Design a protein around this ligand. Sequence first.
Ligand code: NA
Ligand code: NA
Ligand code: NI
Ligand code: NI
Ligand SMILES: [Zn+2]
Length: 537
Amino acid sequence: SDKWEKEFRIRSYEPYSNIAEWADKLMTKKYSDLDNPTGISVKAGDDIIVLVGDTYGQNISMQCIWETGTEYKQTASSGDVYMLNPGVNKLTMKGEGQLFVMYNTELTSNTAKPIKIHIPLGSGTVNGFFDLKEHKTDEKYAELLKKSTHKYFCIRGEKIMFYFHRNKLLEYVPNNILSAIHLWDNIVGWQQELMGIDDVRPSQVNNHLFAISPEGSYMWASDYQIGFVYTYLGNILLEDNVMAAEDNAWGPAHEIGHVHQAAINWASSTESSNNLFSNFIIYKLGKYKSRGNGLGSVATARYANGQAWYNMGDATHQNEDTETHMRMNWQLWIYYHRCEYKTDFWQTLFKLMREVNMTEGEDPGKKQLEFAKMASKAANQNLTDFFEMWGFFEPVNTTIEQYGTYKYYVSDAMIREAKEYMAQFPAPKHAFQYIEDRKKSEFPSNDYRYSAVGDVGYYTQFKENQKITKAITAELAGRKVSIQNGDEAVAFELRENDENGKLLYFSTFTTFEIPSSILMVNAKLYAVQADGKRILL
Ligand code: NA
Ligand code: NA
Ligand code: NI
Ligand code: NI
Ligand SMILES: [Zn+2]
C-alpha cells in the first residue's frame, strides 16, 4: 500500500504561468493557479514536513485550500499560504483542506524546471488525485477514487480540472472519468481555439480552468474558478446526461464563455457575446442545431420598434434580449467559418480586439464601434450593411444596467468616423446579414425555431453563391406581402427610394405582414441575391 502513498508523497511539480499577467494580456477572467494539487489532505494543527529539492532560484509555496461562504459552503479559491525553501520545511496547518504547490513563474526561462518535493510518511493523509496524462485509465481512476477519503477529490485534465464532492463522484461516475474529462477538456480547448491564443499556449500560458461544486447556486463563472452546484453534477459527469438534451451542454459552455468574452464584449452584450462560444460548442458536439431567435426578431426590434443594438428587444434597458443578440457574432462565424470565406476570421478578430484593449464597461458606445471596425479589418471587407442592420449606427445617449451601471453614448460623429474607416475596405462579396444555419424542415412545429427561421437565406445559398434565375414576383394585399418564385433569394427588403435608400423593413419569409408603424410612402420592394444584387419587385 506504500506504492500508492509514494505516487503522491514524492512528486516532481511542474511550473505553471502567472494568472494575473495572462488575464491582462488575453483579456479573460483569471484562470486557476490551483494547477498543482499534492493529493494530500490535512487537519487543523497537523505538523507537516516538506522536503524541497533544488528550486533553481524560484520562489514556491504551499497553500491549504478548504471552504468559504456564509449562506452555504463551497471550495474557496485561496487559503492559508506557507513559504517553502530548498531543504527542510516544517509546517503547522492553521486549518484543514487539501495541499496545493504554488509554483508560478515565467515558463520560457531555462530555470523553469520541475521541482521535486517530498512530503514524508506520517505528514497529513494521502487522499490522492487523478491526472489524465500520467494515470491514463478509468481503472486507475476508480482505484484512486475509492482509496480517497476526503470531502473532495481532484481530477486534473489537460485544460480543465474538477474539484468535486467525493460522494457525488461515487453516486454518478464511480468507475468512469475519461469520457467526462475528455469532453470538458474539448470544450475549453474549443473556446480557446476561436480566440486565436494557440501561439502562446502551452508554451507561455498553461493554467487550467478549475471547476468546483458549490452546495448552493446553480452555475457560474468567475476569476479563479467556475461552479456547478453539487446537486446538478449528474448532468456534468455523464456525457450521456450532457448529450441527452439540447440545453445540457449549453449552460456550462456559456459559463466558460464568460471567462473568455472580454475582448469582444461590451455592456449590453454580456449575456450574449459569450454565446458565440456556446453555439460553437453545440456545433462541435454535432447533435443539435443552433440556438437563438430568427432574423424576424431583428426586423421587429429595429424597424417595427425603432431600437438600436443596446436596447434590442429591451425597452427597459435593464436585462438583455440574449436570444436575438446572440445571432450577430454567430452570423459572422456561419459565413466566414462554416461557408469558409475566411476560416480564421474569429481568431483574427479576437487578436485585433485584444490590441484595441478596451474593458467591457469603460466606454460601451465607442466599443461597439471599435468592434464593427475591427470586424471589417478582420474580414478585409466593409461590413457597414451588416452592422447597420444590427443597429450599430443609431445614436444613443443614456445609461444602462448590466453587472454595474454604464454610460452608453454613440454620437453622429462617432457613427460618421466608423463608417469612413470601414469604407476603406472593399465591398463584401455577400449580403450575409441574412444568413441562417437552420431551415424550417429540421424542426418540429412545436419548436420555437420552426416558425422563427424563415424560408430563405440558408447558408448553402451563400456558400454556393446561388443566383436568382426565376420569374420572381410579389403581390401586396393590405399589409400582407407574398413572394412568388423567390426561393433563390436570401431576403426581401423595403427600402426608402431606390436600392441604396435606407432600409425600412426586411423579411426572410416569402409571406409576411408589414407592421403598421412602417412608413410605406415612396417605399419599394427588392429581393436580395446572395451576393448583394438587389432586384426590384
Ligand atoms: Na505517478
Ligand atoms: Na497532466
Ligand atoms: Ni518517503
Ligand atoms: Ni440607421
Ligand atoms: Zn451568463
